[PDB]
Symmetry: C5
Subunit: 269 residues, 5 copies
């Protein structure tokens, strides 16, 4: 009996994980947190490369880096502690002494990441029709609602599929609102800047859309091939954590780097 | 099973145990706490040069509080996860004494850093008018120390001796009310003779201070806010206590420091 | 149960065990200690540029002492929590030999950083008149080293051999008195030719130094301050010893450095 | 006992076990590795201001690589010490599955940081002539990623499936050769129009790059460099592999960065 | 039972075990060591700007050495405490093989950082007269590497094979004497043409170097300095060895760097 636990624990407790699955998941989480610490150093060391008015972006990027490093390190340790090798069959099985594995660790830490990532672009682009404070408030409210509803949802991904899907849809509504507001922000930011900055802003928009869409994908991952599908397996576990790592790097580090490049081009010198 | 003067989390964990949701949520919220504290440390260090020299002591004290809070919340998260272990037969997390009993006192003693400094730093932004700096500082520090120490004594008896728990809590509340009085005076005097933007920021600071600080005795009382054998005397109350702690920590420390920095900026 | 030349904390833990309150309080006070030390490190680094170049060596040495103290107190907190484990049947923490016996000697050898540097750093703020810098430094360093090493040898015998314990303590006390004399001379000469505010700060520094440094032999003698089989030869004495250690640490290091910084500011 | 797709260190440790010398030396060499990486981090940060502004990006990228390498090598040292435990009866260290299986893949995924950045940073010191910056960078990044991913897949089968091991290794070697080609081009173009001292520094950089990077497929092949049941299919091969890894890491990262810094100094004014 | 090529600390711990005083003292001295190293790191960073630009590299190298030493000593402290565990029945700490055997080799490989850098950094303060910079550097580095490697091989056999122990020690001692010769020359040339205060500082540095560096072969020989079954082949010898290591480390690294900084100050304007 596992109750309201993530599906990684069910797979680990019934079939277990092959060497490749367990080792790969550990490797990808380690890569994640190492990327976050390296990004922290990068964003600190390049602060003085942009005009004063843009440096708040670098600062917020560093804040996000700290959050992500700490969380991903904890999550890597959680993964390696929750599953242990069984010599008889050569697979890693659920070790309850390590606690059940739970992805929710990320969700609450998104309560840092999402507000800040949405916030920092407002320190680079200049709005035209929209009010700064109103856009910020909309970002923050919709982000909080999205994160909390998805957090509740993911606890039931095995024990109660209906709650899982309903909470996911409720979260998706706020997600769509966030996408709308960000589209407005980028469009207004394009107005009245050099074509190079406009190209950077278009790249930022594409990056934002794809990387942020990856997260509900990881949310749904075990069921993307339906019940007892190919992905309801260790393959799905690997896929979920890989998608998480790609999304983390893209939405945080590369996003911050593109914002820094935009700040450089908009800066005098 | 004999637990003595232990927090009610240990009694819940030893009798009913914790569901996956309760245990995991508590771990998540404590992790969020310490991550917020370290991020705030970085923010306050990186923004020091944004204010006039005379105001930078506030940034420095914010960073000090951030260091204290990060260390404490990290240790407390590890304590939580070490004290409770999964029982596979029933699927619940039960008290694991090899990890030591869980105790909230870790927070309390670290408040001996946070409370004096948080109360101190506001005096580096506002200018007093009728009140003396040294007098306000000494009152803040004495009353904070007494509040913290009495509440610390109280919380050990929250299960073993409800009477001592409540008496120590009331004694602490007296010093708390004194602190609220002194802070109200400080905010009012700080409003005198400053720009309207600063006055709006100071009003916001007062409201934030009042609510966030009042949350702490709420967490203190949490297991009994629905009476004996109430709805909250359960894993729900454990979750609520740690949630309220995290909200109060973030609001009273990080947001407080940020608003103080904004006030310093407007006054520069 | 054979413990040999071990500190009395282990004997209390192996015979009576520790109640929840005693164990938890000791953990809390050691954690508070190391958190205070890290916060002090941050403060002293961030305030370096607040004083003239000639005084900044004091800030730097304060930071060095902070590093030493943080590392040592963190290690000691981990040692405390590893050495004693909960017994479910009776609800007390007993000696867990897999965690090693508890020993305060960790502090003593780390004083070989703290004591030379603390005594040294004051020579970068005050100006001597009749005394020679090098002579004062050398006397400070020799007497500190001898005091620390002899007390270190002594504390291993606080239970196994009371005679060696007391004899080594007295030998240490002689060098302690020599240090007190030299520090009195230094402070008196430092008062000569500076403003009255600096003189008041120096008087405060002297009082702080005397009390905080006297606290250490108090912790040394703590288990026997009520004689054999006294009230303090118990978990109460363990709590008192670590509490006195923490108060002395904070006072002699952080507050001492802060007062020195204020003196440097007034002299700048 | 069944180990599946595991590195040969696990098979040696589970069958013969490790003598004191082999186990201790491997631990020492991994510890030395991560210590060198953190020291290099400090050096590259402290010497940033020794070069003109335009060259400081090289210092920054060196520091990023140092962070990656430190984190990875520390984790790997802990993994080594966790996977093998002393057996009192015979005096050898045997596989301790409770510590998890030992796997070199930790280094491969972190190369996804190291290789792109190491190749990138030289473009902030040398000036290209006929080649385009973006094209060289894109080729570097794509070929490095493919090399790393194919070798990572390969190394899981070094015992369980020699054929897949060798096929994936060859595919990786192709991208390696492409990288060597592009780097030779970069060095040649960089030599044009700089002082003879800088040209000598660039020649040294080329030799260092070639040797240090070639050491890595050597470590890949190590257990079989003396054939089946050869001298190296033993604890000697395990220690030799980790030794080659550490030499290659230090040379390809720290000494590479130091030579680039010296080149930047000579080019500065 | 069978310990093989292990350090004598493990033999003492496995046969007689360690009393409370011996075990606790060794742990305390290792902790003191690494604390001193981290404090020195902070000191050397914070005082960089106290000397003229051309001398600041010395500060940097001191910081580099501090990092290495810190990491190594930290690891060694934990290693000590993991290798020996209290036996309740008799009240002594005995070898706990689950923690791994204790090995001093951790120090030796980290000297491959410490020894070259310590020898290198003095060349950034003193001016040579008859000797060539590159020649002195090359000789220092080669002879240091050989000394370290030969001593490292030797120390594994200090119990299992006394003959190899002494032969490798003597081979190391030859390179040690060469290093002493070259350093004496360097000090003599550095004294020429500087103020007498600087000359006195250099004399003090020479004395410090000679004594502190000679302490290391003393620790090498420690268990046998009173012959077979001597007073020092005991827990007293273990304590003495680690104490000598700590004194030598502090003197040869921290105090050495401080004296070099003082020399740089006196030569500065
Ligand atoms: C459950 C279905 C709910 C779907 C709603 C999605 C739209 C979100 C927000 C508009 C609120 C305006 C911004 C609020 C500022 C305070
Ligand atoms: C915007 C905030 C939404 C607030 C409330 C309505 C919540 C409605 C979702 C109710 C969750 C459970 C459902 O149905 C699960 C059922 O138990 C499976 O059989
Ligand atoms: C606060 C929101 C708490 C909502 C948690 C319950 C919603 C879910 O529905 C599943 C059902 O409660 C179980 O079967
Ligand atoms: C965009 C920037 C962020 C890129 C992040 C990651 C690349 C990870 C790709 C790793 C591919 C490995 C796939 C797996 O291979 C194991 C299988 C054997 O059966
Ligand atoms: C009980 C401890 C209580 C709060 C006292 C905290 C005191 C903070 C240490 C600072 C000292 O010095 C104060 C300084 O003199 C001021 O200007
Ligand atoms: C110092 C205060 C000591 C605490 C005693 C008062 C309380 O303790 C509750 C009850 O009276 C004792 O079991
Ligand atoms: C005001 C200064 C001090 C607090 C001293 C007041 C001490 C309060 C005594 C109450 C105790 O707990 C006893 C109850 C269960 O018997
Ligand atoms: C046993 C009780 C004896 C200890 C108490 C008195 C001790 C130190 C003796 C006084 C000499 C000062 C210490 C030696 C130093 O020398 C100073 C320096 O040489 C000048 O330049
Ligand atoms: C310097 C080395 C010193 C020996 C210090 C020992 C001085 C006297 C210690 C007590 C005696 O001997 C110990 C006895 O075994 C109690 O158990
Ligand atoms: C599977 C067997 C491997 C076969 C051997 C492969 C080695 C070299 C491959 C390709 C040349 C170009 C590939 C890298 C270039 C792709 C994108 C680039 O961009 C160029 C321009 C943008 O501006
Ligand atoms: C399959 C995973 C591939 C991972 C490795 C492939 C190379 C990507 C490395 C870095 C992008 C860092 C910043 C991207 C933009 C920098 C240059 C622009 O401006
Ligand atoms: C830098 C390396 C330091 C030490 C690393 C240890 C050796 C490295 C691998 C070597 C070549 C092996 C020789 C291969 C040539 C003979 C081929 C064999 O024979 C095949 C059948 O048998
Ligand atoms: C055996 C190899 C040993 C290290 C010998 C010392 C090598 C340390 C050199 C550090 C770097 O290389 C700099 C180059 C200069 O131009
Ligand atoms: C038996 C094991 C054999 C160990 C082999 C070599 C030690 C070589 C250490 C490196 C020192 C040699 C000279 C140096 O080279 C640096 C060069 O001068 C920068 O320009
Ligand atoms: C160069 C490494 C040479 C390693 C030398 C191998 C050590 C063997 C020695 O002596 C052993 C006898 O016993
Ligand atoms: C410090 C290391 C110096 C060791 C001194 C001598 C070994 C004399 C040559 C070896 C003779 C072996 C005697 C058995
Ligand atoms: C650094 C983290 C970032 C940018 C996180 C972004 C999160 C999302 C886009 C969340 C999406 C969710 C839904 C739209 C539906 C299901 C639940 C979520 C929380 C996964
Ligand atoms: C960052 C931490 C802060 C601001 C802590 C503030 C602490 C309090 C407001 C303490 C309150 C207490 C009482 C008023 C009554 C019951 C006991 C306490 C200690 C929880
Ligand atoms: C930060 C640490 C400081 C200032 C330590 C000071 C140490 C002492 C005052 C030592 C005192 C001792 C004696 C005078 C007698 C008994 C033994 C000692 C070592 C505790
Ligand atoms: C700091 C790390 C660096 C520069 C790593 C470089 C990695 C390689 C040159 C990898 C090479 C490989 C092949 C050419 C063949 C076999 C598989 C690899 C991945 C080991
Ligand atoms: C910080 C560490 C330093 C300066 C290390 C210095 C090392 C030595 C002087 C090495 C000495 C050795 C011999 C001369 C003979 C026996 C073997 C050694 C390796 C201990
Ligand atoms: C255009 C916007 C959509 C971007 C593509 C989203 C892809 C989601 C994939 C879900 C993860 C599947 C992993 C196998
Ligand atoms: C110049 C600085 C002046 C600082 C004055 C502030 C004083 C704060 C220290 C208060 C210490 C209170 C002591 C509490 C004793 C605890 C008794 C507990 C009773 C059970
Ligand atoms: C220029 C600096 C001159 C240094 C002055 C003296 C300060 C160093 C004193 C070192 C004291 C070491 C005492 C240890 C002796 C061993 C103790 C054995 C038991 C008594
Ligand atoms: C632009 C020139 C670079 C050519 C890149 C492609 C070369 C492919 C060669 C692959 C060699 C495979 C290695 C086989 C090892 C036996
Ligand atoms: C006993 C001599 C063994 C050979 C080592 C001598 C080489 C060191 C001097 C040259 C450098
Ligand atoms: C272990 C004894 C070694 C002492 C070395 C003293 C240094 C002698 C050179 C002067
Ligand atoms: Na595991
Ligand atoms: Na747990
Ligand atoms: Na414990
Ligand atoms: Na091991
Ligand atoms: Na131990």
């Amino acid at each position: 009996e596992l109750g309201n636990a993530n599906f990684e624990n069910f797979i680990g407790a019934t079939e277990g994980f092959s060497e490749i699955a367990y080792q790969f998941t550990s490797h990808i989480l380690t890569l994640g947190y190492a990327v976050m610490l390296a990004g922290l150093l990068y964003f600190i060391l390049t602060i003085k490369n942009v005009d004063k008015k843009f440096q708040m972006s670098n600062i917020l990027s560093a804040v996000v880096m700290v959050s992500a490093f700490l969380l991903l390190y904890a999550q890597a340790q959680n993964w390696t502690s929750s599953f242990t090798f069984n010599e008889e069959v050569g697979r890693y099985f659920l070790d309850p002494s390590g606690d059940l594995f739970n992805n929710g660790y990320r969700y609450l830490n998104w309560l840092i990441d999402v507000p800040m990532l949405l916030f920092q672009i407002l320190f680079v682009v200049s709005l035209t029709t929209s009010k700064f404070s109103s856009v910020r408030n909309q970002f923050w409210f919709s982000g909080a609602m999205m994160i909390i509803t998805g957090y509740i949802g993911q606890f039931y991904e095995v024990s109660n599929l209906t709650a899982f899907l309903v909470w996911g849809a409720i979260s998706s509504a706020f997600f769509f609102h966030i996408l709308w507001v960000m589209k407005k922000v980028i469009n207004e930011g394009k107005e009245g800047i050099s074509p190079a900055g406009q190209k950077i802003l278009s790249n930022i928009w594409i990056l934002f859309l794809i990387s942020w869409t990856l997260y509900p994908g990881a949310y749904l991952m075990p069921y993307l091939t339906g019940v007892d599908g190919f992905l309801y397996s260790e393959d799905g576990v690997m896929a979920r954590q890989l998608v998480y790592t790609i999304a983390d790097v893209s939405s945080k580090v590369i996003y911050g780097v593109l914002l820094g490049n935009l700040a450089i081009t908009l800066s005098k010198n």
